[PDB]
Design brief:
Blueprint (H helix, E strand, L loop, with lengths): L6 E2 L8 E6 L9 E8 L2 E4 L3 H5 L10 H10 L10 H8 L6 H7 L8 H20 L2 H24 L2 E2 L1 H26 L8 H11 L11 H4 L6 H18 L18 E2 L9 E2 L12 H7 L2 E2 L4 E8 L2 H10 L2 H8 L4 H10 L10 H12 L5 H7 L6 H12 L1 H17 L1 E3 L5 E3 L8 H36 L4 E6 L2 E7 L3 H13 L10 E6 L8
Parallel strand pairs: 1-4
Antiparallel strand pairs: 2-3, 3-4, 5-8, 6-7, 9-13, 9-14, 10-11, 12-13
Helix pairs in contact: 2-6, 3-5, 3-6, 6-19, 7-10, 12-13, 12-18, 12-19, 14-15, 14-17, 17-18, 19-20
Length: 534
């Protein structure tokens, strides 16, 4: 596009598609280098991008949310609107990058604003064509997808406070521990060496101590945690070095000069299953309930005079597994408020009711978690200390107890082979073409994703639908939605009403959609992310 005489004076008419180029960054830190709009065959280019911002009523076009971030920094209430990226993601979730989308649905996404604006216009008409004939996919767009871009616009622009005194004061502590570990690694091999150097580590392992190999073999350390105590200590050095270098020492260098907060980038077109994602920092890989990963959570604090409110969905994937299954026995564990891990152990072992167990329940949790994606017997054995005789027979005790779960898995794989895709409760779908693939490594993979996608995906949609419904109501209480990770949402509310916001959030989240099983929401009010844990 466009042809004839097409440049026009700024401003554009309402409903024009915006295009923008930012300075090679992420929006709360970037400069608006160029802005333009396309409508009806003509393109409007901004004289000066920042003053131009105030003429748009809404940002509609590719990556609309990232212009709302920039625009909230500056202090403008510019909502995001139609975004082709969201159409293309609903069409097929492997559409993750605008570069990807441009190549599939005709287009070349380039570094020039009027050009990104014209592409936004075409792709919206193309993609919306493809979609009005899809009831479930339109609903998701109007009721979850486009409302969520508003919430993510605010979450990302608002930010979370950090406690830099403590982050500095945690760096030396973990640095000290790296020192003791390294002293151990040293009077265990004999003399000092550079743990961070491949030649020296090959020499000490495969020559000086004579450990068995010729990293070198495959990724030997991950496999040789059985010979000397040292390979254990080496891995502990390597993971504490990774945590020090990615979530303690970087984190004060991302606090923002103008706001004083960290600005996590929230992406909603990144994961396979429709779950949100974080970028700098990537919150999902902070080890949860582990001393170190809890030590990092103490660093996120509320503003002086506010309280954090963290809310968590209890067993969201087993609760949606009982609903999509139809399993009377899994439904009744939660409908009567029973501990799924005890009750599973009761059924599985048939021990006269719930009595003199404990061990049975550790085996019950391990099958419970392991079915969720497909924990094979030998893995089941390696985790839950058994051999490959009881191992198989426990997969089968689980499905004698909860047999419609197997019905559901056999159903969904059959439906996945025929239809060519699986779908969440709401209609979001992932295409699984490899289910018949005749190469074992990949066909098993397709079958993990086909069963995972209805569970994880529905868990996602419920969290997503609970956020768009909660956002308006928190606004008229003065509260703010800050962070979303795994199945948890973190709010900030002033002290004077932290109690009441906690009440409303829990209530909207447990009642988001009528399921066959009660959704449970755990809520904690505290001055930092770790104290709110309750």
């Amino acid at each position: 596009s466009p042809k004839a005489l097409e440049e026009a004076p700024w401003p554009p008419p309402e409903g024009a598609f915006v295009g923008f180029v930012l300075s090679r960054k992420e929006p709360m830190w970037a400069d608006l280098l160029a802005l333009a709009a396309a409508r009806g065959g003509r393109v409007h280019r901004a004289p000066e991008p920042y003053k131009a911002l105030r003429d748009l009523k809404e940002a509609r076009g590719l990556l609309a949310k990232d212009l709302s971030v920039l625009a909230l920094r500056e202090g403008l209430g510019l909502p995001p609107g139609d975004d082709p990226m969201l159409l293309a993601y609903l069409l097929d979730p492997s559409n993750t990058t605008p570069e990807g989308v441009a190549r599939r649905y005709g287009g070349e996404w380039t570094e020039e604003a009027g050009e990104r604006a014209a592409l936004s216009e075409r792709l919206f008409a193309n993609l919306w064509g493809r979609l009005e004939g899809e009831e479930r996919l339109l609903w998701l767009y109007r009721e979850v997808e486009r409302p969520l871009s508003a919430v993510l616009a605010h979450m990302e622009a608002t930010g979370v406070r950090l406690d830099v005194a403590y982050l500095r004061a945690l760096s030396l502590e973990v640095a000290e521990e790296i020192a003791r570990l390294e002293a151990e690694v040293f009077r265990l091999a004999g003399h000092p060496f550079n743990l961070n150097s491949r030649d020296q580590l090959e020499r000490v392992l495969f020559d000086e101590l004579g450990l068995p190999a010729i990293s070198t073999s495959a990724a030997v350390l991950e496999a040789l945690r059985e010979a000397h105590p040292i390979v254990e200590k080496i891995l502990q050095y390597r993971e504490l070095t990774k945590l020090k270098s990615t979530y303690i020492d970087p984190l004060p260098d991302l606090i923002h000069p103008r706001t004083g907060r960290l600005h996590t980038r929230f992406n909603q077109t990144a994961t396979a299953t429709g779950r949100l994602s974080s970028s700098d920092p990537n919150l999902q890989n902070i080890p949860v309930r582990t001393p170190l990963g809890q030590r990092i959570r103490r660093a996120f604090i509320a503003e002086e005079g506010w309280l954090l409110v963290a809310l968590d969905y209890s067993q969201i994937e087993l609760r949606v597994l009982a609903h999509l299954s139809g399993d009377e026995n899994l439904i009744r564990v939660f409908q009567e408020g029973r501990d799924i891990h005890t009750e599973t152990a009761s059924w599985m072992f048939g021990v006269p009711r719930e009595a003199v167990d404990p061990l049975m329940r550790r085996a019950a949790k391990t099958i419970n978690f392991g079915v969720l994606y497909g924990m094979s017997a030998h893995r089941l054995s390696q985790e839950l200390a058994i051999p490959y005789e009881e191992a198989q027979a426990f997969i089968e005790r689980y499905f004698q107890s909860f047999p419609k779960v197997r019905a559901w898995i056999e159903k969904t794989l059959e439906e996945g082979r025929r239809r060519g895709y699986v779908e969440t409760l709401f209609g979001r779908r992932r295409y699984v073409p490899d289910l018949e693939a005749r190469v074992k490594s990949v066909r098993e993979a397709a079958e993990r994703m086909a069963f995972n996608m209805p569970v994880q995906g529905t868990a996602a949609d419920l969290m997503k639908l609970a956020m768009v419904k909660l956002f308006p109501r928190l606004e008229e209480m003065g509260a703010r939605m800050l962070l979303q990770v795994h199945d948890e949402l973190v709010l900030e509310a002033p002290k004077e009403r932290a109690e009441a916001v906690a009440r409303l959030a829990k209530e909207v989240m447990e009642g988001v959609y009528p399921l066959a099983v009660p959704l449970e929401v755990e809520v904690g009010i505290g001055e930092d992310w770790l104290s709110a844990k309750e």
